[PDB]
Amino acid sequence: MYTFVVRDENSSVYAEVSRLLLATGQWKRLRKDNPRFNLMLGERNRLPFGRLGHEPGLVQLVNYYRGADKLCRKASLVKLIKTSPELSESCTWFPESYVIYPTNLTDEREVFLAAYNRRREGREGNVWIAKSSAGAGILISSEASELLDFIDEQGQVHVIQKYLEKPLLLEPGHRKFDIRSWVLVDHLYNIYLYREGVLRTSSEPYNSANFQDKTCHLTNHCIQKEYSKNYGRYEEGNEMFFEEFNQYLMDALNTTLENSILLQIKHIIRSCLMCIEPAISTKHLHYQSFQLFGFDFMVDEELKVWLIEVNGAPACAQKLYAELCQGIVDVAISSVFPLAPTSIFIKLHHHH
Amino acid sequence: MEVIELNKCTSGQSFEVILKPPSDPSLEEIQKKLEAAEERRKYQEAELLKHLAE
């Protein structure tokens, strides 16, 4: 009989894992403050890692990796990529980004202008996009004056990265999209990629001559279901699954999803998680960690995959909650606390 | 990776390696604490003896 506590009631993912754990008749839930737990479904912010692994005789496991924010913060991910020799500033799959602190507070203001002034003179496309983790607030513009003036009007760290002006557009529609891949890293630091991804598509025709109307450039589910007028026309809920996206690539470009995109996705996921492994691994620690990650990618018209961001507390597509959450229990929880396939994951083998 | 101040003797040696440069109560006050606590104990005990005498 195992015990777990719930410290994030808003997690739609672990609400199901918690629902499944109880349904097994071999797990029991305790008050959120009871320390005699085997498994912690912890809070998103200020998770008390320092109190784990100090209960005599209790193998304790938590659903977050201490230190993973270095990957799931806009500014942290930029600093991690430019400063890590494994990733380097020559990293070919991450957009040219810069950390920019508002003038009311290191910083990369001048370096951005140097590269910016370089594109303007070379007749090249010089459209950027500024954003921050403290947003629901995004601004796309080809003028450097508007990007920096927008960050000074705020008060949190921002990052300006090159806007992919030549994205891959689905047909019919001429519309943008992004790809969300779910990744589970277990206590042994095996990287598991869930076999089911989803594309969050824009129901509006892409328009490179008007960044003011941000409905055809941003593919977020809330923006499309609120400010877009063609929501749910092509695919149900602006969500297209891999089976359809793969068939489309075969009929249109005569290529498969595995060859043209998935190989680069699996490479980016491996590169990022292997980089921070020495810093976050719980191999020789007094407690164990696993975490579910949501990687967001962009695909350009050359079939090159770009990394957008990494989410540390990701939600899931409605149609995939069941399969994925059961997978979490199998390889992440029951692997440490066994009960009394054809795995839904793809192990990305690496040199620990 | 620099080494400085290497000191060597018969029973060992010591040195320093730099990898990167940077960027009370008086005796009287204590006596009061102790005697204040002792007095509070005597007050509590006197109340108990009073309770018992009743």
């Binding site: 015990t3 305790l30 008050r31 403050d33 009871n34 320390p35 209790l58 | 003896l49 018992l52």
Partner: protein, 425 residues
């Protein structure tokens, strides 16, 4: 040298006390005449805790036998180990207490109390560093209940900073002598709430149910009930009588077991309890499961009806100290809904190498559970059923008491219940 002065008062108090000294005297190798005839130095390591060393290597219990009638103490003096007691330590009267708390506390007992204190004083003066006192008594009679609590109040006046520990037999209508037992028990609980530091609640009904249902005794007797109290007293005092870690003095026990001064009434327990399938070895899991099972508890309170504030467990014998820690953490980590979570690590375990006579190993359980409130609810209910009609009160008002004194004792016991109920939530 942390000596303890033992006092036994009244019929129940002296019969249970007699068996206690009989049991531990055997464990320490002391024969009925006080002479030592053991074979292990562990039997003398802490022997001075309960025994005074007289001339000729004789060991005399540091015990005082008190009663208002001679009958029961004549039995002790003619019992198995009767010769072992210091003759001067028999203090008795002739009139008796008639199962009347007021006689033990105000009239008959008052006349005799000063000579009891003279003996307590003598025993204390012969202690290098007195730890405190333990008293065996019942709450439903007159001498052990009434005079017993009177002694405690007068001992507190003279040794206010020493520990006062009691083994208190709670009455039950199932093992009853008179209808006034709820009266006497409620008046005593009032004293105990205020003037003891630790009270082991021994419910005669739980002792009966154990003898009947578990031990398969068709007709249990006081003698059978007292065998369980002997084994329990031997178990709870094992930490004091044999070389045990954590020092284990009554003052450290109270500090770590009593988070609130009034809530100092413990549920004791013992394993094994086997019926004559008695030669079988008992594994550590079995010891632990039984020790935590309600059927093995002497207070007749279902621990699942409340929560544990603190728990002490003493294992005796040569066993796997690793396997003990595993099973103790297993019982905790499998029922953590019955342990308050605002007292970290409130379950402590101690091991002793010397097992009880005739057992390869055993476990004694000491629990401070809010489920003990059900014992006081029982007494309160029985008390009010009679007191609302003022039935049998004349036995008490005839000795000078007023009804008000009953109303106050009742209110304090019901307050104790409410206090347990608030920490259970």
């Amino acid at each position: 040298m942390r000596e303890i002065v033992h006092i036994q008062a009244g019929q129940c108090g002296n019969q249970i006390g007699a068996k206690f000294w009989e049991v531990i005297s055997d464990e320490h190798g002391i024969d009925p005449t006080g002479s030592y005839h053991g074979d292990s130095d562990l039997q003398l390591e802490r022997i001075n805790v309960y025994y005074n060393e007289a001339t000729g290597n004789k060991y005399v219990p540091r015990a005082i036998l008190v009663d208002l009638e001679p009958g029961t103490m004549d039995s002790v003096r003619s019992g198995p180990f009767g010769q072992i007691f210091r003759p001067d330590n028999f203090v008795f009267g002739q009139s008796g207490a008639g199962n009347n708390w007021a006689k033990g506390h105000y009239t008959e007992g008052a006349e005799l109390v000063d000579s009891v204190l003279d003996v307590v004083r003598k025993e204390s003066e012969s202690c290098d560093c007195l730890q405190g006192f333990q008293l065996t008594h019942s709450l439903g009679g007159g001498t052990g209940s009434g005079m017993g609590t009177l002694l405690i109040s007068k001992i507190r006046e003279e040794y206010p900073d020493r520990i006062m520990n009691t083994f208190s037999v709670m009455p039950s209508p199932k093992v009853s002598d008179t209808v006034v037992e709820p009266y006497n028990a409620t008046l005593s609980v009032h004293q105990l709430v205020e003037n003891t530091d630790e009270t082991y609640c021994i419910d005669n009904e739980a002792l009966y149910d154990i003898c009947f249902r578990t031990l398969k005794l068709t007709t249990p007797t006081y003698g059978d009930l007292n065998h369980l109290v002997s084994a329990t007293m031997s178990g709870v005092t094992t930490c004091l009588r044999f070389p045990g870690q954590l020092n284990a003095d009554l003052r450290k026990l109270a500090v770590n077991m009593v988070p609130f001064p009034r809530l100092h009434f413990f549920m004791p327990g013992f394993a094994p309890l086997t019926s004559r399938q008695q030669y079988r070895a008992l594994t550590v899991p079995e010891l632990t499961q039984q020790m935590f099972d309600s059927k093995n508890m002497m207070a007749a309170c279902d621990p699942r009806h409340g929560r544990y504030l603190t728990v002490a467990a003493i294992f005796r014998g040569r066993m796997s100290m690793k396997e003990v820690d595993e099973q103790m953490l297993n019982v905790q980590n499998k029922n953590s809904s019955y342990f308050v979570e605002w007292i970290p690590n409130n379950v402590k375990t101690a091991v002793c190498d010397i097992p009880p006579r005739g057992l390869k190993m055993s476990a004694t359980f000491i629990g401070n559970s809010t489920a003990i409130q059900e014992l006081f609810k029982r007494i309160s209910e029985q008390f009010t059923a009679m007191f609302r009609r003022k039935a049998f009160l004349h036995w008490y008002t005839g000795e000078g008491m007023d009804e008000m004194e009953f109303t106050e004792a009742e209110s304090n016991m019901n307050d104790l219940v409410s206090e347990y109920q608030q920490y259970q939530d």
